[PDB]
């Protein structure tokens, strides 16, 4: 079943420039349902973590120009929509969040040696408003520790 | 005193007069001859007054306890059995004529007759009381199988109106009640 999620991620990374970005939002609620269910062997927490790593790679390559506040809006519009569908836990504890947080601060630390201070402190002030009242628990906290070490 | 009960394709239709006499004096112009035992099961009592009020309370007590324990709406045949057990056991001490009629989810609409001996029999229509001897010929030539509800309301209205006119012990006002799956529709007529 994650072969469908593999071929849709294979459909996105080739077609970020050809296809328009709203089709990623038209493919957003499908991967939201694939992250929701959770099965034994077909889809798994590691395959869910990789499919979010590929879209956040496609959303950072798309927002690698001066226009950055689409990935910051659409993820926040994704994380808010995933809260209102699910009950209290989002789906899991680590994979959908902590890798992608460690992805973004890896993207931020790579971009800061070329990019200006504006969209990255827009990025830092958006994730500081995330990790002040969203994911403030342990597992993990080094992704927040190097965040405020890069923020300072 | 004249009581009346006719079943149809849905539920049943009940009816009685309202005149209570003490032998030549009207002690009560208007009387609820009919009695709610349960939400879908009525009776309509005849004969004595102190006796039939005594029995109808005890049956309402026993059927009420039995249905809560079983946690379902009861059967009309179950309620007809309980009048039979008391009136047969105390047939030397009770002068009671009861017609039980009510809607049931299992078997639709039912009419039973428990006369003063203490037997029990299901009928399509059933009459009773002191004025019921005057409408035997009318109810046999007018009843036709397969009536609607409004035909039965018109049927019992003409049947009670004749006996009230001709019998002296029967009269007052007409009380009707239509029990169905939906609800109980009670009304009071004249004519």
């Amino acid at each position: 079943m994650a072969d469908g999620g593999s071929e849709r991620a294979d459909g996105r990374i080739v077609k970020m420039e050809v296809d328009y970005s709203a089709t990623v939002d038209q493919r957003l609620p499908e991967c939201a349902k694939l992250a929701k269910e959770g099965r034994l062997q077909e889809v798994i927490e590691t395959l869910l973590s990789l499919e979010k790593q590929t879209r956040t790679a496609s959303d950072m390559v798309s927002t690698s120009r001066i226009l950055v506040a689409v990935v910051k809006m659409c993820y926040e519009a994704k994380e808010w929509d995933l809260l209102n569908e699910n009950i209290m836990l989002l789906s899991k504890r680590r994979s959908q969040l902590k890798q992608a947080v460690a992805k973004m601060v890896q993207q931020c630390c790579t971009y800061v040696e070329e990019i200006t201070d504006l969209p990255i402190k827009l990025r830092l002030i958006d994730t500081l408003r995330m990790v002040t009242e969203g994911k403030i628990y342990v597992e993990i906290e080094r992704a927040r520790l190097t965040k405020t070490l890069a923020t300072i | 005193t004249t009581i009346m009960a006719v079943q149809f394709d849905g539920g049943v239709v009940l009816g009685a007069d309202s005149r209570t006499t003490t032998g030549s004096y009207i002690a009560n112009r208007v009387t609820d001859k009919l009695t709610p035992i349960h939400d879908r099961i009525f009776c309509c009592r005849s004969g004595s007054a102190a006796d039939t009020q005594a029995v109808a309370d005890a049956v309402t007590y026993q059927l009420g306890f039995h249905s809560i324990e079983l946690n379902e709406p009861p059967l009309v045949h179950t309620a007809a059995s309980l009048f039979k057990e008391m009136c047969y056991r105390y047939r030397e001490d009770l002068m009671a004529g009861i017609i039980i009629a009510g809607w049931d989810p299992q078997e639709g609409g039912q009419v039973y007759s428990v006369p003063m001996g203490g037997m029990m029999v299901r009928q399509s229509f059933a009459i009773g009381g002191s004025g019921s001897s005057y409408i035997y010929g009318y109810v046999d030539a007018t009843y036709r199988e397969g009536m609607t509800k409004e035909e039965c309301l018109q049927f019992t209205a003409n049947a009670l109106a004749l006996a009230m006119e001709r019998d002296g012990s029967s009269g007052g006002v007409i009380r009707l009640a239509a029990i169905a799956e939906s609800g109980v529709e009670r009304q009071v007529l004249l004519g």
């Binding site: 809260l83 009950i87 209290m88 | 005890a58 007590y61 009420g64 306890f65 809560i68 324990e69 946690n71």
Partner: protein, 240 residues
């Protein structure tokens, strides 16, 4: 210490106590279950989980939420054999109130009749004192909702929000912190606190399949056991 046969039958101790009855208070805790009662401004919620150990067992013949009369429901804790014997007594004396007196029994007067019977079992020494608890709800005319609790010693009192079962001293400690801060209580405010108290004490955060809700309302005085779908509806609604 022990004098005579004060550990065995219901007589007094030299310390002015007795022991069989206070053994019966922790005869509930072998049941392994906890039930919570919360009264709001126009409702009264009963919530109780159930444990289903076997897949070869029904999901219908298990729930302790019983119906005494059409306007009075209850919940039972303790052991099960003593519980259903207690309920048939309550069903029986509710109906005798109708036959003798004519009107519907108040929920307060029923707890006197139960606690009197439990008194006598304590009282005469040659019989067992029936260890199981009792919680009632119901709507009174010109008095609103009520919540009571009979005990196997034989006493009762009214409450505002009081749990029973295994966990009380954590459950009642939470309800005190909930009540004394003087919040509003409407309907869903009352239902959500009855879940989250049982949620935080048991520390489960469950699936809507174990608990049952038995609310009664001023607008609808019929005792009503909630559907599993609408139980799931309240649980996701309080979830943010």
């Amino acid at each position: 210490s022990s004098a005579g046969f004060d550990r065995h039958i219901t007589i007094f101790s030299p310390e002015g106590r007795l022991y069989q009855v206070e053994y019966a208070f922790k005869a509930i805790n072998q049941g392994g279950l906890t039930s919570v009662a919360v009264r709001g401004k126009d409702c009264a919620v009963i919530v109780t989980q159930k444990k289903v150990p076997d897949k070869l067992l029904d999901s219908s013949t298990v729930t302790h939420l019983f119906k005494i009369t059409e306007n009075i429901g209850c919940v039972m804790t303790g052991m099960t054999a003593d519980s259903r014997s207690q309920v048939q007594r309550a069903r029986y004396e509710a109906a005798n109130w109708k036959y003798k007196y004519g009107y519907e029994i108040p929920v307060d007067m029923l707890c006197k009749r139960i606690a009197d019977i439990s008194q006598v079992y304590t009282q005469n020494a040659e019989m067992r004192p029936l260890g199981c608890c009792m919680i009632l709800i119901g709507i009174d005319e010109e008095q609103g909702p009520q919540v009571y609790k009979c005990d196997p010693a034989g006493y009762y009192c009214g409450f505002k929000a009081t749990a029973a079962g295994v966990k009380q001293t954590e459950s009642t400690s939470f309800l005190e912190k909930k009540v004394k801060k003087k919040f509003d209580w409407t309907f869903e405010q009352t239902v959500e606190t009855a879940i989250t108290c049982l949620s935080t004490v048991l520390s489960i955060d469950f699936k809507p399949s174990e608990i049952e809700v038995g609310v009664v309302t001023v607008e609808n005085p019929k005792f009503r056991i909630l559907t599993e779908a609408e139980i799931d509806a309240h649980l996701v609604a309080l979830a943010e």
